[PDB]
């Protein structure tokens, strides 16, 4: 699989943005 950033950006860009 290859989508680590797609998994981290959600923990910060989702609502923490």
Short mmCIF file of C-alpha atoms in Angstrom, two decimals:
data_model
loop_
_atom_site.label_atom_id
_atom_site.label_comp_id
_atom_site.label_asym_id
_atom_site.label_seq_id
_atom_site.Cartn_x
_atom_site.Cartn_y
_atom_site.Cartn_z
CA UNK A 1 0.00 0.00 0.00
CA UNK A 2 1.15 3.61 -0.50
CA UNK A 3 -0.84 6.43 1.15
CA UNK A 4 0.78 7.39 4.47
CA UNK A 5 0.55 11.15 3.84
CA UNK A 6 -3.06 10.65 2.77
CA UNK A 7 -3.49 9.19 6.29
CA UNK A 8 -1.60 11.93 8.19
CA UNK A 9 -2.93 14.98 6.31
CA UNK A 10 -6.34 13.86 7.62
CA UNK A 11 -5.17 13.99 11.25
CA UNK A 12 -4.08 17.62 10.78
CA UNK A 13 -5.71 19.04 7.62
CA UNK A 14 -9.16 17.51 8.27
CA UNK A 15 -10.19 19.76 11.20
CA UNK A 16 -6.89 20.73 12.89
CA UNK A 17 -6.22 23.00 9.88
#
